[PDB]
Symmetry: none
């Protein structure tokens, strides 16, 4: 499991957000197990969670994610 | 499982968002197991979750995701 | 499972969003198992989930996703 | 499990956010186990969770995440 | 499990946030186990959790996260 990233090197990249929420419940990244034997989970990269969510320009530079997720029996 | 990313190198990339929500529930990335034996899960890359979700220009630079997900018995 | 991405190098890329929702429930990426033996899942790339969802210019740069998902018995 | 990142080297990168929420519950990254035997979880990269969440320009420089998640029996 | 990061080398990178919340509960990163045998968890990288969360320019320099998470029996 190898990840390699290389980077070699007027409004730009500007965000305005206004949010109004009377009630918010946000769970993000969740793993829940109840009465479970084996649970293998991988979350990688960018997760944005919101009642309002904005992602801008998330990976302008090279980004690499490598995941091996699992079990051997 | 190998990921490689390489990058070699007027309004641009501008977002305006206004959101109003009286109630919001957002779950993002969730794995739930109830009475489960084996559960293998991989989430990779960018997940944006919102009552309002905006993704702009997510990977201008080279992005790589590699996933191997599973079990061997 | 190999992914390689290479990048070599007036309004442009501008988004305006207004959203009003009295109630929102959003689930994003979810895996649920109930009374399940084996569940192998992979989510890759960009997922945008919203009561309002906008994706703009998601991968201007080269993007690669490679997935192997499964089991060997 | 190896990750390598290399970086070699008018409003730019500016965000305005206004948020008003009467009530907020946010869970971030959560792993919950109840009556569970084995639970292996990995969260990698950037997670932004909010009643309002903004991510801007998250990885301008090269970013690498490598994960191996799992069990061998 | 090896991570290597190398870096070699008008408003820029400016954020304004105003937030008003009458009530906030935020959980950040949480692992909870109740009546559980084995629970292995890894959280890596940047997690921002908020009733309002903003992440700007999180990794301009090269960032690497490597995780091996799991058990061998």
């Amino acid at each position: 499991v190898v990840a390699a990233a290389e980077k070699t090197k007027t409004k730009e990249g500007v965000l305005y957000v206004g949010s109004k929420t009377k009630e918010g419940v946000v769970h993000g990244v969740a793993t829940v197990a109840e009465k479970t034997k084996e649970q293998v989970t991988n979350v990688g990269g960018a997760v944005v969670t919101g009642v309002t969510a904005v992602a801008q320009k998330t990976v302008e530079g090279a980004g690499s994610i490598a995941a091996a997720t699992g079990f051997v029996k």
